[PDB]
Design a protein around this ligand. Structure first.
Ligand SMILES: O=C(O)[C@@H]1O[C@@H](O[C@H]2[C@H](O)[C@@H](NS(=O)(=O)O)[C@@H](O[C@H]3[C@H](O)[C@@H](OS(=O)(=O)O)[C@H](O[C@H]4[C@H](O)[C@@H](NS(=O)(=O)O)[C@@H](O)O[C@@H]4COS(=O)(=O)O)O[C@H]3C(=O)O)O[C@@H]2COS(=O)(=O)O)[C@H](OS(=O)(=O)O)[C@@H](O)[C@@H]1O
Lengths: 189, 189, 189, 189, 189, 189
């Protein structure tokens, strides 16, 4: 019983100002979990979408700027796809862009420019070995939609060039999911 | 955002015994409401299936017998489709089968025989005028999935021939519904 | 060195009687392990079928009744396919059939009727995440035929309607397996 | 339930040295039994390959030398196929090669040369009459895989020319067999 | 960013002499890890090949002999492919060749003969269950190129026939690997 | 062993204000060396990218503005390709644009506008004679990847109109190179 749908979530991210003169970059990570998109249900149905299995097909991360088009001290960054839960260490002012030479690098124009990334994440099945599957719609694993313990999906790391002014963003993540085995429970009343 | 699914519900019906010698029939009615198939949800989602609109496409009423194949004093009844909320009055021992000459009559062999009816019900929009639409999948009205006040659908009346022995049935109603406008609400936690 | 064969096993299951008047259902689970079908071998060959690897292709669960065709208080249940080791909790008299709205539900006529289910199980690789593969004969994983520690395969849950009389069954599970790498060891004597 | 497989076995054979000056030959025989290739099983399965019937299709006898390529006093012998259990009498130093004029003679170069023979043996059904079947894959008799009393198959006799030095060989016999009627027994535990 | 290349490594293996008269075999195992082929890098690049992911496509194990062609007491062994990290126990003088009846057995002529094996190994993801994938270039898992903790690949076991003389070999393993996501880091200086 | 790839780097360039009233321009050159893009390796491998050879195909210079779009006192400049390491003399405020009439001139809008150039640089073999090859992908030379002594490549010089305000740019370079002769070294540990 397949049901492809779309789930979204919005949150903020700010790159604080720095008095540093050099071009330094701010590094951070981004994971994706389905608990943040799918709330708990009620009653005999533990989740709000009554299905048993799921598998995330795609994610769309949108960096919607919060800064005016008149803001100066512009910069240039990079967003890369990291499917293994080993990101570059979080840094405030690093002397280089680590994600620049990555094959999945897209340039981030800053601060007043929109940046989208559309890709297929991978689940963290074993963080010790960090193995994942290649892209195959027919062979992608089905995970279970747990009650409160779903596994973290992974796949984006960023590097933003710091500035004299604060750079704020409203980040909207949209997960395109595919469920299976409609499992609604209908007790009496 | 269409989602065709199937919702079921099971309950009992008994035709009590009678010392009456004549062939008399027991008349009863059967309505269908979605509150009995779809429970209330939890939180910002008032219902367990997160959709706004619905329209019932078909219903399958199954009379599953509870009586052995050795039971005697067998009989013959009738099930008809009544799409207007004006049934023959409920009777314990009526001297005739009212639903026998109906164009939608199917014979009910009793007591140990299975009887199915598969039809398209109609909602009770105005009980004073009792108007309904003909069968058209493209023009069928969309109703709202209310929180606790959904409208009764209608469409089956029965007439069972009484017997010296009690005739029990387990009735399983299955509604084939079609929802629209996925309306999940995801507050923070 | 492929060798497709068929292994069987027979055991009993009883649904005890209840004085409860309502229609209640008895819920139970069913797992499949190869130790119960393949005994230990002898000598340098740890198992009786001299192969290294295996993968279960299909299972046929047959509920052969033990009750006469004259037994009354008949009922109606459901059998569903549960490929993840999270079954509905075992219950003696539950007020509803949980497996009724499942997409893999087959109706169980009770008590004197035969019920078969033919499906492809999945192994329990990680019970925490509960991931499994879709059906693909070419990409199905090969497991190792361990000596005394094989992994449990999963895939059936049932719900039987209780009765005044005891409902007994002789359950015959047949696993259709596929082995690989003939590994017979022939020491002298 | 046919299963064609391959069973092997390795053992030694030595032609001891002789001070005799003349060219003399050492004669010996070679039978084939399935007990030497198939060990006893364990439990309710008396044999390690769980089948009832068998029939030997082919045998490959390989004389793998043990002697260096610098060894002198080389010689020339003969291997023939003897399907009736009446071999030339075993001799240490016979004044001629008895198997030389046989229609199934292959020359054995000695001592450091490989010799293979690939043929279809015959079972010893009656040693008094010594009757056997011609080669026909469709009409070949099925024998029973006994527990500890299988019948000897026959089909090779050799004649090695003696030498001043010892001539050792590692003989690897490979039987290509065909079983029938998978008969595994699975008691409880 | 794919880059198919070839990495090699050379090491020794000796089968010590034995006074035992019988034909006995020496059993040993062979695993493959990428730390032994890829050294650690320097600086911000933890490895010498600047890539993130890898997957081993093929391995070529070459037994280059160290013994002269005049060496006697020759023998015959077997090399088999074992993709699950459960080898036959290491033995000095075992009374039989365990890897002889394996479907992946290749004969090892000893001592002065070259033996190659070209196959696709499998990683040890779970040693408890020992599951692996079949051969599929498009669906083969990508592993991470760790810093100092890469996972062991597996796939060869051997059985050498012992001798009066020591049998030495220089074993050259060549792994054909496929990397992904060029991740060079270029800080200033 | 060919390997095409991409390397990049980022640095700043500013044009200090001038109280001069006339239209004056500021001149500066730009060289290209691989040591700035490719850090040193570690251990036996002197460089992080294990190859012997390289030859630059293309370079992509990117003038990313740091200024707002509201800035006044706009101007206009020029850039040109210079393949000999004999540029126009560096100047602060020159009364004309030297690089205007060059055939390889691309106009530069200032101060808030993007500017890019995509060309083939050339090496400096002999600064005295200043010779090179026409563009040819097949006949281009292969240079050696030295340890700390690689040669400077060349190919860009600029001219920026001065202003009352400071014009700051973030310059990103991108090189498209092509290596050869994979030269990895695997000592033991
Ligand atoms: O006759 C004249 O016009 C004289 O002009 C002035 O001499 C100045 C130079 O003009 C000035 N350079 S400017 O850019 O033209 O202003 C400055 O040169 C030094 C700078 O570090 C570099 O100059 S630049 O022109 O390349 O920018 C340059 O560094 C070179 C180095 O010279 C190279 N070796 S050499 O063989 O050429 O000597 C090589 O080592 O690479 C270096 C780095 O180059 S890179 O491009 O950065 O990679 O040369 C430097 C140098 O030679 O000193 O200084 C010159 C000397 O004057 S001062 O610095 O002592 O003041 C003078 O007048 S004024 O204009 O300064 O007032 C005067 O000598 C004449 O009028």
């Amino acid at each position: 019983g397949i049901f492809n749908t779309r789930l979204s979530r919005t949150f903020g991210y700010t790159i604080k100002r720095t008095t540093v003169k050099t071009p330094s970059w701010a590094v951070d990570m981004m994971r994706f979990n389905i608990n943040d998109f799918l709330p708990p249900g009620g009653g005999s149905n533990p989740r709000s979408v009554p299905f048993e299995y799921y598998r995330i097909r795609k994610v769309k991360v949108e960096f919607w700027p919060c800064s005016p088009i008149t803001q100066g001290d512009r910069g240039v960054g990079s967003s890369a796809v990291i499917l293994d839960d080993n990101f570059v260490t979080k840094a405030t002012a690093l002397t280089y862009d680590p994600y620049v030479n990555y094959s999945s690098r897209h340039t981030i124009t800053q601060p007043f420019s929109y940046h989208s990334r559309y890709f297929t994440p991978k689940p963290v099945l074993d963080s010790t070995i960090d193995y994942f599957q290649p892209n195959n719609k027919r062979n992608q694993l089905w995970l279970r939609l747990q009650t409160a313990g779903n596994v973290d999906h992974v796949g984006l790391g960023t590097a933003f060039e710091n500035s004299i002014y604060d750079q704020e963003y409203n980040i909207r993540v949209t997960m395109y999911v595919q469920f299976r085995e409609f499992n609604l429970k209908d007790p009496p009343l």
